[PDB]
Amino acid sequence: GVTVFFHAIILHKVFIRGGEEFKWLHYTRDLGHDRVLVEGIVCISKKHLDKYIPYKYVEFIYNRCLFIKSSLLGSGDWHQYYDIVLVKGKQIAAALMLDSTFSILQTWDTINLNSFFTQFEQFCFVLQQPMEKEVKRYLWQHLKKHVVSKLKTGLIVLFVVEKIELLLEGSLDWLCHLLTSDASSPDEFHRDLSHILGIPQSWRLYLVNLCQRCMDTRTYTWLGALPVLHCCMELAPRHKDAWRQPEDTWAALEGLSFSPFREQMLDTSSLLQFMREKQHLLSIDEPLFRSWFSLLPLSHLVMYMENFIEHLGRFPAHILDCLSGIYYRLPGLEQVLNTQDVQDVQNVQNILEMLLRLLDTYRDKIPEEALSPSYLTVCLKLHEAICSSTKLLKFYELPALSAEIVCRMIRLLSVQTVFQGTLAATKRWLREVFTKNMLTSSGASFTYVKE
């Protein structure tokens, strides 16, 4: 037989009766609050599964209907809830459902986890189609109260809110802090995440819908949660032309539109402060750095390479990523160089000087397993842009720095073609810059003082 556990809300004796599929109970705990929760167990045949089995309580209806659906039955027991014998009862029963379904998470293990998942799926199937802002608000209340081993509960809360379509109304902070792993080690992170992510479920989609929020609502705590998403993403390895990968893949932000948030986030100082607080994350998840490099505007990229110079010293294979990131910003760079604003051009010069610092300082430290010649090409791209947008002569330092980057990359190691392209771009820049002769008609003075 397959068993069903009916619950109900309201001396007298209650009885369970209906169709003869089983013609014509016990006290659980009298909550108080002017109500009692009365339950009952009954085991029906094993062939009556997924069949309508209307029932009754002797009940006042403002016939009930059961569906023991074979798609949600686990060990073989079903749990029917929310039976009342309205909105007030709905809220009370939501509270009790939350408490009951979380009373199984005591011994975090695959067994109790799957039991919780099965009970939740069953009851929510019964709930969403029984045949509501207040309900969502009160459920958020009880959830926050019951919850405030942190990563598992964060993922569980995320799964729940996505199942109950409970948007995080103004407090993404708390859930993103829960999903933020204080673990300073990668193995510990994977250990905390595995027992809960190994379950077949839509973790990636939930995390992506959580990350899109906190970006469309203009916040930053979600960054600390990016690592988890990455474990759920199962990203692919880099190839011979990693530069050809889109910015969303290379940055490990698939399914997220970050360019709008990147360009519309008006306070990047707090972003960098949050980052520096959670710098340990960079060690447990490699791509995180990249992701961050992708979520920062071109005006606050040097600070990101400076504050986290130590990490790059521990992880020099990230230096190259910087270049890649800058490549994915080429338009903006050009948008800045095609103009003559000294501040932004100077920021770009600073960026390139920082990249040269990284190369030289950490020239004797990069791991040959991450030093692909693709970056050479990437560098060349950069050069071309710096030589195509930089029209004035008082900005030779940027073509010079680009050529120096190419030189250091070649020294780190096709090559001839990249050198040809670099020389060609330099000659083109000199041509489009030196349009008049070097010396005056008399020859006494030069035309361009800086030639």
Author numbering: 378 to 387, 397 to 408, 412 to 413, 420 to 453, 463 to 466, 477 to 499, 522 to 567, 583 to 599, ...
Paper text:
RNF213, also known as mysterin, is the largest ubiquitin E3 ligase in the human genome. Unusual for E3 ubiquitin ligases, RNF213 possesses two unrelated ligase domains, an RZ finger and a RING domain. Unique amongst E3 ligases, RNF213 also encodes a dynein-like arrangement of six AAA+ ATPase domains, two of which contain Walker A and B motifs and are catalytically active.
Similar to murine RNF213, we find that the human orthologue appeared as a monomer with an ATP bound to its catalytically inactive AAA2 ATPase domain. Accounting for the flexibility between the individual domains of RNF213, the murine and human structures can be flexibly superimposed with mean Cα deviation of less than 2.1 Å, indicating an overall conserved protein fold. By solving the cryo-EM structure of human RNF213, we discovered a carbohydrate-binding CBM20 domain in its previously unresolved N-terminus. Due to the flexibility of the CBM20 domain relative to the stalk, the CBM20 domain in human RNF213 is resolved at a local resolution of ~4.5 Å. We therefore created an AlphaFold model of the region of interest, which, in agreement with the cryo-EM density, predicts the existence of a beta-sandwich structure in the domain and thus supports our experimental evidence for the existence of a bona fide CBM20 domain in RNF213. A large cluster of 23 positively selected residues covers the CBM20 domain and the exterior face of the adjacent stalk region. The RZ finger is connected to the E3 module via linker peptides that provide the domain with significant flexibility, thus explaining its apparent absence from the previously published murine RNF213 model and its relatively poor resolution in the human RNF213 structure. The resulting beta sandwich structure is stabilized through a bound metal ion, presumably Zn2+, which is coordinated by four evolutionarily conserved Cys and His residues (C4505, H4509, C4525, C4528).
